[PDB]
Design a protein around this ligand. Structure first.
Ligand SMILES: [K+]
Ligand SMILES: [Mg+2]
Ligand SMILES: [Mg+2]
Ligand SMILES: [Mg+2]
Ligand SMILES: [Mg+2]
Lengths: 95, 290, 51, 50, 247
RNA sequence: GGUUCGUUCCAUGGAAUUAACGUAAACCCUUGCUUUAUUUGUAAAUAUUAUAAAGCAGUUCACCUUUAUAUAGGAAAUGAU
């Protein structure tokens, strides 16, 4: 339905196996955003390490971490990497 | 002239001699007395046993552990003692664990599960291939490419699949599903040398896949789900275990298919194919309305 | 004499492709890195055997 | 710590919980793996106990 | 009309998780044929007809896989072993399997045209050296040589060139049995002198083709491809660079 | 760890599988050869200089040596070419 006009969720649509509209109902939130730097033969190379958490709000939480020179791609990586790492968390009385 | 002409006669006489020699071999080959042949090297492949006793396991050197110095004290539960400088694995512990794995390989095959027999050693190729034929499973006799389970989307990308019904006969109409479906993963791995390939067993524990392994005295028993304490360095003990597990799968597939003929399916559509069905109805609903 | 050819997709010609992307970036609030991915995503490559 | 966390003995406990509920709240859980019921009554043996 | 209620994806080949599925499937078939037809007699190696088996690259391309050279080396040994079976005793299954490994490659054929001899007995050999092209008309004679109408002395003022022009006839000791009428164009003194060497040699071979082994060691059969290198921008000459100032 | 002009190739590693650019290949000139065309170029001519379109060609074959038997290398005016 045009929800994913970039194609980033297609690769994830196979691992977890659920519609793209259902991937947008998950609660995502960027938690950490580090500005790391690697010294190379061509000078400093600054990257953006981010950690994103994904959960449906009913006992599933996934943690993902990725980095890239672009802050936009680093968040989309962890987002996809966190939705596929979701695991059931036991909760007493769901509270 | 006369020298090379001799070969022409010999090369032309091989068919006649072979036929005559084959016939003569059926006349006087067995006349003296009956030989009590009770062991043939290639007997675990031509006709493996359904169940291994203590005599079979001992004769196959399934109790020879590694040097006492090179041991993992974690698996001190299966050791019987010490002799000839090596640890002797208990023949009873090897049989009880082998009978349990056979019950695991049988049920997984009874529920339509995909088994994988993994033995990667110089001479373990005929054993694994034979076990797979019986259990209708997949074989692997070379270095397991790291990531074939956790990174299956890339490694097993172009490998073809097929959809089969209860009676294992292919179904038509899943052409669009076999292009977006992601590659498969073994529902059960049977490693004949867990000490060698730990990258495979780790992907199974990381992907929640049961495993069966032959734990030698120096192998870490926490690498698999169902251990089989035995000698993995012996080519004669591995062919016996694989035969038992191979026959277990065969006996499991027989029950599954025999039950299908009675309209009793021992398994339900996997989640992956299940989701495709729901989308099919959604797309079909539009045709009904429109 | 004119020989105007009609293109089905705007990716089969670099002249048409570089102008569409340019008009998209002229907006002050244009997301550069995102406008490029939406165009690449529309460029389908044929299945091939890398071997 | 050169070793790795091997959870091969809990593949059932882990798979049984991940298949109990659905990630998409409001829908029934999809069918579990074909091996979840085969080893339902065949737990692993106790390892690492001197 | 709808889909079957029960369905599950199953791999086609049993070698689904191997490095090269399509290859092993064909390799296990050979191992299977080498188990039931192993009792058949063999033929000595010297009596096996030469066969051009496919190379490692051909299998990689037809199978679309990356088969290891070591794993293929052992699969090829089975092909050579199964090929040793006696033809009359060899079954039809092995024959078909062995016909898929034959390499049907034919190298391109480029046969040079032989230099003819005119009705009057004059063969025209062509030789070039770095700027020029000669045309020697060698005939049976007393040993007269005319380079472009003039004699060998009135054309080449340097005896080093006279000996190099008719070196072919000198190494073979036939200066006194052939008459040459050369016609050169372009190049310089040495460029034309050495050009005539390859012309008379080629023309001489038209009369006595058995002299090539001698002209080979005399150096009158090889065409020297050395050529003046072009001038390159930034250089004073082909390679001479201008002065470099560090400061 | 070997080998290669070369992250080339082979083998192997308790983690690898791959994509793009450079590299390589290919391209233009040049070299031998085949076919085509013969003017404004070529003495004649049954076509051989020149002109210029296309195609083929190499480390190919032979000889010697060769590791883990997996990948090869050497010899350079007196093997062929
Ligand atoms: K020409
Ligand atoms: Mg061992
Ligand atoms: Mg100069
Ligand atoms: Mg590698
Ligand atoms: Mg280049």
């Amino acid at each position: 339905d045009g929800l994913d006009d970039k194609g980033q969720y297609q690769e994830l649509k196979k691992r977890t196996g659920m519609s793209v509209r259902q991937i947008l109902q998950l609660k995502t939130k960027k938690l950490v955003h580090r500005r790391v730097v690697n010294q190379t033969r061509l000078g400093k190379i600054a990257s953006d390490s981010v950690m994103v958490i994904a959960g449906n709000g009913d006992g599933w939480l996934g943690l993902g971490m990725a980095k890239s020179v672009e802050a936009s791609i680093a968040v989309e990586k962890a987002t996809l990497l966190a939705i596929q790492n979701m695991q059931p968390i036991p909760r007493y009385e769901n509270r | 002239d006369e020298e090379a002409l001799k070969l022409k006669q010999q090369i032309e006489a091989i068919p006649g001699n072979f036929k005559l020699f084959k016939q003569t071999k059926a006349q006087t080959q067995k006349l003296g007395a009956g030989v009590e042949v009770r062991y043939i090297p290639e007997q675990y492949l031509r006709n493996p046993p359904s169940d291994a006793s203590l005599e079979d396991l001992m004769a196959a050197q399934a109790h020879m552990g590694h040097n006492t110095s090179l041991w993992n004290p974690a698996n001190a539960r299966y050791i019987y003692g010490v002799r000839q400088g090596i640890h002797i694995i208990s023949l009873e512990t090897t049989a009880t664990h082998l009978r349990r794995a056979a019950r695991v390989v049988e049920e997984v095959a009874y529920r339509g599960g995909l088994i994988l027999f993994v033995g990667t050693r110089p001479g373990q190729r005929p054993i694994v291939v034979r076990a797979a034929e019986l259990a209708k499973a997949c074989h692997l006799f070379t270095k397991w490419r790291p990531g074939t389970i956790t990174n299956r989307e890339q490694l097993l990308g172009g490998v073809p699949l097929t959809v089969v019904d209860e009676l294992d006969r292919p179904l038509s109409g899943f052409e669009d599903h076999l292009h977006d479906r992601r590659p498969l993963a073994p529902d059960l791995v049977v490693c004949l040398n867990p000490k060698e390939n730990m990258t495979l067993l780790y992907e199974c524990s990381l992907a929640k896949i049961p495993t069966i392994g032959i734990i030698d005295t120096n192998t870490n028993p926490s690498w698999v789900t169902y251990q089989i304490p035995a000698n993995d360095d012996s080519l004669r003990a591995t062919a016996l275990i694989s035969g038992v597990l191979g026959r277990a799968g065969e006996r499991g597939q027989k029950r599954r298919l025999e039950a299908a003929q009675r309209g009793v399916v021992t398994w339900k559509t996997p989640a992956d194919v299940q989701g495709y069905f729901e989308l099919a109805s959604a797309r079909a609903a539009d045709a009904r309305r429109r | 004499e004119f020989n105007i050819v009609n293109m089905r997709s705007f990716l089969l010609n670099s002249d048409i492709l570089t102008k569409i992307l340019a008009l998209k970036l002229k907006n002050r609030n244009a997301r550069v890195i995102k406008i490029m991915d939406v165009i690449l995503n529309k460029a389908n490559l044929p299945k091939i055997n890398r071997v | 710590g050169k070793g790795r966390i091997f959870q091969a003995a809990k593949v059932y406990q882990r798979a049984s919980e991940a298949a109990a509920t659905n990630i998409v709240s409001g829908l029934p859980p999809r069918n579990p793996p074909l091996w979840l019921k085969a080893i339902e009554s065949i737990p692993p043996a106790e390892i690492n106990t001197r | 009309f709808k889909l079957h209620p029960y369905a599950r994806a199953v791999p086609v080949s049993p070698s689904y998780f191997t490095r090269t599925p399509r290859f092993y499937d064909n390799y296990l078939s050979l191992e299977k044929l080498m188990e039931e037809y192993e009792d058949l007699p063999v033929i000595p190696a010297t009596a096996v007809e030469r066969v051009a088996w496919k190379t490692l690259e051909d299998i990689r391309k037809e199978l679309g896989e990356q088969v290891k050279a070591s794993e293929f080396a052992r699969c090829l040994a089975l092909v050579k072993r199964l090929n040793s079976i006696h033809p009359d005793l060899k079954p039809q299954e092995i024959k078909d399997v062995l016909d898929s490994f034959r390499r049907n490659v034919q190298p391109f054929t480029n046969v040079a045209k032989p230099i003819p001899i005119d009705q009057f007995g004059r063969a025209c050999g062509v030789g070039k050296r770095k700027a020029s092209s000669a045309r020697a008309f060698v005939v049976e004679g007393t040993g007269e040589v005319l380079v472009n109408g003039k004699t060998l002395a009135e054309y080449f003022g340097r005896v080093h060139d006279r000996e190099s022009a008719v070196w072919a006839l000198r190494a073979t000791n036939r200066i006194d049995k052939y008459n040459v009428w050369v016609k050169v164009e372009g190049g310089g003194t040495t460029g034309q002198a050495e050009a005539i060497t390859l012309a008379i040699a080629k023309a001489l071979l038209a009369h006595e083709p058995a002299l090539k082994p001698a002209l080979r060691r005399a150096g009158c059969v090889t065409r020297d491809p050395r050529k003046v290198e072009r001038k390159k921008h930034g250089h004073v000459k082909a390679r001479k660079m201008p002065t470099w100032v560090k400061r």
